[PDB]
Design a protein around this ligand. Structure first.
Ligand SMILES: CC(C)c1cnn2c(NCc3ccccc3)cc(N[C@H]3CCCNC3)nc12
Lengths: 65, 279, 286
């Protein structure tokens, strides 16, 4: 009787969204405004905004009513 | 998230025919209620549609000059509220001039755009007694509007998907140099798309992508490779065909849209006023 | 209406709650903004560890929200001196809390009011996050936040220093405070004011430095504090194993960015270690 992590399975009906940590490596973060030192101090990073924008762009792009 | 949102499950419809059926059913039940309560006074569904388009323009005008500036998401949510309300309700029962203000009020609350009621009603171009009366009507209709929306308040607008698509084009599509050139024109097309029933017929991502691709086609830039390669629609060719015909249908909807005419709006407004005198 | 009033469950800041047929009904500005926030957020969310909004109705300017009926909450469990909280029970509570929080965070929503009384439990032992009257969406730069969120005993230092932009770190720090409460059976940092809360945090965990919290001084209400060393974690939670201490440290990292997310916390070896989390039907009830 143990626990094993399994990621959440939610169909976005759209293209694959790159992982949050990889956005810097893949060059996405060059097209969003960087988080200010106050934002970083509070824990807000530009990667959050970029990831949410990408997810909303790709959400349900292929889905049919 | 849109992909598990109430908008996708309950407020995206199969075709314009289903929308017309819902609106005609609204007209029919209003007629039945009116005749059972106790004729050229009634308007046909097409007249109701003309009035609804005119008052959606009026709601956009109200939200554009609203101080303090409403975030564009609030305006989109309010316009979506108006469309959804008049899918299943007749302008003859609930006046669009007040329902649109209730839509703006509820959208301001829902989208966490903190404005006090005195400020909201001071935005209205009315006398102070007129402003207070309008506030009373808005308070009367707030719960009615929420009930008619089936308590589905979060509205997914196409603008954040538009920004995400712009980020993706800037990153993974070097062939398109400076995707920001596509912004304003796509924005324009987006607005035109907002006038039709597409917001009830397609996903916000599809709407944003259609606007971007129409902007690209207007400039001669072709990015079929974006969908083919960058979006990796290679294993599922039918998915690419489905996407392309969805955009084609959006463009057709924008093509066939005709704005309401001022004289026709005036006569239909007079008819609506007579309808609201009684019943 | 289709519900019949059964009991009186309590009185709140913005509404009173009754039992009904089993459901719980929560009854010039217009409709109350807290009720609208709850409605709009819980309509778009569907997860076993998030409170379910079954219905919503009202009359004129008053509004009632119908949720599922919750047996108890974590505050009663913690305060019940007759309940032995085994490591497995603690792991189960943290696991359900973190799964609900993970689902909430993927949908870009912060609870911002995490505390043991907001973690409700049903008769089946399913922990659900409730009281979304302070919950808000995050991940958009043009979204003004309030730093005076979260109860003080569970408020994160970035909030206590006045962060108006934050992420999942607020919920994670509240989760760490809840874990400490479950381990010690008393509030971890029961400050009497904002300054006292910060002082207690720094006396117990050590005053953070520029290395631990790179942009500490950039926060609007940054109070320059004395450099206390802080009690070692194994001294505070004497019965906490190394994996649990690692989880606590990750949850209590002063840097919100380095502070572990719900997914990262779920991936920690503590949850996959022996013993496993107790099933819901075996969780202690008051
Ligand atoms: C989701 C909400 C509506 C809900 C669901 N169940 N439930 C219960 N059930 C019983 C109980 C008793 C003690 C501790 C936990 C639960 C009580 C209650 N009381 C409110 C009163 C106002 C201040 N906050 C708490 N709210 C609820």
């Amino acid at each position: 009787a143990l626990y094993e992590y399994q990621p959440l399975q939610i169909e976005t009906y759209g293209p694959h969204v790159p992982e949050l940590e990889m956005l810097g490596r893949l060059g996405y973060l060059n097209h969003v405004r960087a988080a200010s030192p106050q934002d970083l101090a509070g824990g807000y990073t530009s990667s959050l905004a970029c990831h949410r924008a990408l997810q909303d762009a790709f959400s349900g792009l292929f889905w049919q009513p | 998230m849109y992909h598990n949102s109430s908008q996708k499950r309950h407020w995206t419809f199969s075709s314009e025919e289903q929308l017309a059926r819902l609106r005609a059913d609204a007209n029919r039940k209003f007629r039945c209620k009116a005749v059972a309560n106790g004729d050229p006074v009634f308007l046909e569904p097409h007249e109701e549609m003309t009035l609804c388009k005119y008052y959606e323009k009026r709601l956009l005008e109200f939200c554009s000059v609203f101080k303090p500036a409403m975030p564009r998401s609030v305006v989109g949510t309010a316009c979506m509220y108006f469309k959804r309300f008049y899918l299943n309700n007749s302008v003859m029962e609930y006046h669009p001039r007040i329902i649109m203000l209730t839509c703006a009020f509820l959208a301001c609350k829902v989208d966490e755009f903190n404005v006090s009621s005195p400020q909201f009603v001071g935005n209205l171009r009315e006398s102070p007694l007129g402003q207070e009366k309008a506030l009373e009507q808005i308070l009367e209709y707030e719960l009615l509007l929420i009930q008619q929306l089936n308590f589905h308040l979060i509205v997914h607008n196409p603008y954040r998907p538009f920004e995400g698509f712009l980020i993706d084009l800037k990153t993974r599509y070097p062939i398109l140099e400076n995707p920001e050139i596509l912004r304003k024109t796509a924005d324009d097309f987006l607005n035109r798309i907002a006038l039709t029933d597409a917001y009830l017929l397609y996903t916000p991502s599809q709407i944003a992508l259609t606007a971007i691709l129409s902007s690209a086609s207007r400039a001669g830039i072709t990015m079929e490779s974006y969908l083919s390669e960058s979006l990796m629609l290679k294993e599922n060719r039918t998915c690419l065909s489905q996407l392309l015909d969805i955009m084609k249908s959006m463009r057709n909807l924008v093509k066939k849209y005709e704005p309401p005419r001022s004289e026709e709006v005036a006569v239909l407004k007079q008819k609506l006023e007579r309808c609201h005198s009684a019943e | 209406k289709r519900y019949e009033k059964l009991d009186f469950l309590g009185e709140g800041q913005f509404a009173t709650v009754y039992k009904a047929r089993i459901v719980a009904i929560k009854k010039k500005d217009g409709i109350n903004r807290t009720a609208l926030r709850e409605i709009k957020l819980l309509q778009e969310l569907s997860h076993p560890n998030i409170i379910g909004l079954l219905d919503a109705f009202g009359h004129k300017s008053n509004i009632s929200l119908v949720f599922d009926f919750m047996e108890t909450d974590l505050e009663v469990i913690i305060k019940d001196n007759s309940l032995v909280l085994t490591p497995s029970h603690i792991k189960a509570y943290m696991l359900m809390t973190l799964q609900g929080l993970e689902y909430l965070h993927q949908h870009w929503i912060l609870h911002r009011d995490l505390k043991p009384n907001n973690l409700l439990l049903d008769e089946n032992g399913v922990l659900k996050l409730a009281d979304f009257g302070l919950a808000k969406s995050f991940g958009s730069p043009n979204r003004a936040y309030t730093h005076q969120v979260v109860t003080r005993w569970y408020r994160a230092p970035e909030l206590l220093f006045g962060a108006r932009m934050y992420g999942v770190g607020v919920d994670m720090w509240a989760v760490g405070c809840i874990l400490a409460e479950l381990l010690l059976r008393v509030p971890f940092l029961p400050g009497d004011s904002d300054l006292d809360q910060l002082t207690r945090i720094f006396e117990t965990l050590g005053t953070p430095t520029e290395e631990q919290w790179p942009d500490m001084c950039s926060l609007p209400d940054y109070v320059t504090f004395k450099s206390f060393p802080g009690i070692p974690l194994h001294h505070i939670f004497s019965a906490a194993g190394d994996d649990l201490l690692d989880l606590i440290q990750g949850l209590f990292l002063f840097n919100p960015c380095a502070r572990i997310t719900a997914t990262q916390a779920l991936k920690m070896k503590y949850f996959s270690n022996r013993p496993g989390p107790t099933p819901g039907c075996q969780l202690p009830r008051p």
